[model samples]
Target: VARDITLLECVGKGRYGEVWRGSWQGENVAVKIFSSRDEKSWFRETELYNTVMLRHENILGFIASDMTSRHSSTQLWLITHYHEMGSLYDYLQLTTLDTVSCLRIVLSIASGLAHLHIEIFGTQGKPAIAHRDLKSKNILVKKNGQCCIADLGLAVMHSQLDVGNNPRVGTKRYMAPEVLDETIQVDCFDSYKRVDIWAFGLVLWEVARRMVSNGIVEDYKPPFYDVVPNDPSFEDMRKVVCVDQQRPNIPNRWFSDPTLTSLAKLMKECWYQNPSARLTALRIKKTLTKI
Candidate 1:
């Protein structure tokens, strides 16, 4: 029953490839098809599925992958659980959200990230893992009121790699200070934890903007739209994130919302130039617990 598998509406498109809502065996699912040029992306995504058994309420679940000839073109498809809520980026566009809903989304993501940063079973000798590229587009919300992290195609496994060289893997705004500086050691996994924590804080900020009653926040700008997309090298992020000392701008309009102000204060600690000064994911969960 081999078919051409015509793609329906385009749901998402990025550097790696395109994603669409497709059908197979009478099941409605989301299909992420990798471009021929994304050789490494396919492998990276495979490794993530192979190693991390999806369990968190905030992480997407893998359903299956289909490899078939698209006429003459080589096609690779990765299927996963689909949600109708779109992405956190799209959710915030409405300009307002209840504090409870905001906290629920943020806490779920924190819990998921904490699960990755801390090994539940230390006896297995498996350390924490990190989502090298985390952003709004990578997060998905379901109708059941669950928020999950998607697009693990850029995920990193630190428990095995001895020497790693990842320069500017994540979006520009979410790039931690250390990552922008190209000072991560794959042999040692401390930077991975710190950087992941830094990303979590930025996400918290994004959530904060929605809790507001006014207009959109300033940091809502596309992570690195101004940079050269053709070859967005690490040096470019370093110049923009580190040398320029530019961060996701905080909107002056949000100063009125108490919750946003509280989150903004906590996020200030995350943008510290020193990675160690940034709050840990575990610590952030606890802090959010109070709020």
Candidate 2:
């Protein structure tokens, strides 16, 4: 299927690639053309999609992987259902969606993570996985009033991994201390699980602030934005997230909101320097449901 094609526009650029809006066969599709520099990143995402036939409300669905996109280069092209409004990061900038909408958004993401983490056994079961990169920018909002979690290039699975080879894949602002420490046992299911929770909590903070006057209290810095870049060393991340006890700050603005206050407190718990102290995806789901 091919439409009067025009690379509608360059939507956004991320560490590994660029996202574009294009029309294909009369339908709008979000085309993610990988930077030749990140061929591996594209494969990781392609592999993740192949591993699971995904169908979760909060997870972006894989529409097609055009393996034969080009004749000259062995480049892989991935296309998915694109939301016209694009990332939640941009959407939140416009207006704050209500609490129910916010919780469902988080819950939807959690549910998708839950599916990936439930390591099924047998002929086709893969080990639990982690999307190392979890942030507001990676999340997409649809016209249907739903938010979707996108980008799994940094995803890690239980089966294949090399601790020494682990590249710092997540956003600096949202990374967990253990990820930077290299001390945490990588193979452990809980290790990656905790990382997910920590990032999830940060995303929760972003969602809560979308509506409040002036957004997240002036004191809070939404997880990782405070970190200096230029591949800040692991030691750097450790000091900030662990030793300094410099976890995310919750604003007093939440004090007026019982639901928001409760959420703020819960997010604080997730930021605890001790990895074990962080919440679990399953537990986070329960808390959101209870709210």
Candidate 3:
């Protein structure tokens, strides 16, 4: 697989490593090359993809995982279906969404998250999964206007047998109050799911703000853009989220539109100080279907 694919262009570069646009058998694919320090992320994502029947419309499609020696050094590669539209974060910055488009985007994300959180039982049963890191940048925009959840390196599965010991933490800006204050129940699988809900709420806010209502729309901003720095630290997040208990502000204009009004209330429920009070991903998906 490594020998057959050719890297075309570097699409993204981050702390993890470089993501390239690659071609294989006349098809375009995304190739994520893991940094030496992040071999665990590569292994975890590859293990989950290989072991689980995780195929879904709103989850990123996995193609192959390879470890190839390049110039006497090993390079870890994870290849997947490429989305030309890029991430939701990049899309929201360039396009203002209509009511239907906004609903489609958020609902697709809710569906993906719910799928990960639910466990199926039977001979071909699946364990529940939790995305420890859920953010706009980790969600890709598909050509059909729906978004797919990506970056499973921080994901956890609900299994008593094999809980991973990855030391990597979620993005500080999206941390829930419980996580920020260090009160999250580490032993309980539900705690991780709740943390994802908090981040989902923030993403909802981001997409909702971009929806044009009464010919009014807001510029794209990350969660806590007004209160925190571009790269917020752990202390900065703890102060704002745990101590100050501040959430992203909802514009008064949202109240004028029925869809936005419902969304505003829904996202608020996800931001509750008590993690148990937050709505489940399945519940969120159900509510968005109605909205």
Give the best candidate by TM-score: 3
lDDT string for model 3 (1-291, tens) is 778999999988888899899999998999999987787788888888887867889999999898866676878999999999998999999999998899999999999999999988776667889989999989999999999998888887875334577777888899989898999998889999999999999999999999999999999999999999988999999999988989999999999999999999999999999999999999999999988
What are the lDDT scores of the predictions, listed in order?
0.70, 0.72, 0.91
- TM-score of structure candidate 1: 0.82
How well does candidate 1 match the true structure, expressed as C-alpha RMSD? 3.8
CA shift of 171, model 2, Å: 1.8
Task: Count the clashes in each prediction.
Answer: 1, 3, 0
Candidate 2: how many backbone clashes?
Answer: 3
Error of 1 at 284 (Å): 1.0
| lDDT digits (tens) for residues 142-256 of candidate 2 | 7777677888777777753522233436776677877776667666767877888888888888887764533453322345556645556666777887777675555667787
The residue pairs found clashing in candidate 3 are none
Pairs in steric clash, model 1: 58-148
Q: Residue 182 lDDT in model 1? A: 69
lDDT of 3 at 216: 98
Best to worst by TM-score, what's the order?
Answer: 3, 2, 1
Better of 1 and 2 by lDDT: 2
